[PDB]
Amino acid sequence: GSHMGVQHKLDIFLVSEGIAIKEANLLKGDSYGCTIKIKLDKEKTFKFVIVLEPEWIDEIKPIYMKVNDESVELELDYKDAIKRIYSAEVVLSSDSVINLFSDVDVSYTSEYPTIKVNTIKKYYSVQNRGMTYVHIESPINTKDKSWKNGWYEDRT
Ligand code: NI
Numbered sequence: 071g072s073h074m075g076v077q078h079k080l081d082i083f084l085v086s087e088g089i090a091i092k093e094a095n096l097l098k099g100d101s102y103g104c105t106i107k108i109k110l111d112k113e114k115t116f117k118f119v120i121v122l123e124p125e126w127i128d129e130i131k132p133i134y135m136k137v138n139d140e141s142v143e144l145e146l147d148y149k150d151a152i153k154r155i156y157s158a159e160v161v162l163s164s165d166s167v168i169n170l171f172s173d174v175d176v177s178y179t180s181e182y183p184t185i186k187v188n189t190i191k192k193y194y195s196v197q198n199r200g201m202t203y204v205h206i207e208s209p210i211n212t213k214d215k216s217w218k219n220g221w222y223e224d225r226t
Pocket of ligand 1: 072075
C-alpha cells in the first residue's frame with residue numbers, strides 16, 4: 071500500500087565488450103547510477119547503452135555520466151511513455167572510472183552498484199551490489215538488444 075516506494079528499472083550495456091549490467095536500479099528510492107571501474111592497458115572505444123524504465127511518477131530525474139570525474143554528454147536515442155535509451159562512446163587509454171548518477175547525495179551514491187570490468191583478462195565482478203540485486207551476463211543476450219528483415223517498399 072505504502073511500503074513499496076519508488077522502484078525504477080535500469081540496465082547498462084557495454085555493447086563493445088559484450089557485457090550486460092542487468093538491474094542496477096536501487097531496490098527502492100528515486101535515484102539511479104553505477105560506478106564501473108575499468109582495467110585497461112591500451113586504447114579502446116567503449117560504447118554505452120543505458121536503458122531506464124522509470125517508476126510511474128511524473129518527474130523523471132535525468133541521468134548523467136562522468137568519466138575519470140569529467141562530465142560526458144549522453145545522447146538520448148529513444149524516449150516514449152515507458153523507457154528512455156541513452157548512449158555514449160568514449161576512448162580510454164588507462165584504468166578508468168565511469169560514474170552514472172541522477173544525484174550527488176552521498177546517501178544516494180553510496181547505494182549505487184560498484185562494478186569491475188577487466189579488459190586485459192576478460193574478467194568482471196560486482197565489487198559492491200549497493201542497495202540492488204544487480205547481476206551480469208557476457209555476451210549480451212540478443213533478446214535484450216532492443217535498439218526489420220523483410221525486403222524494401224517504394225514510398226514514392
Ligand atoms: Ni505499501
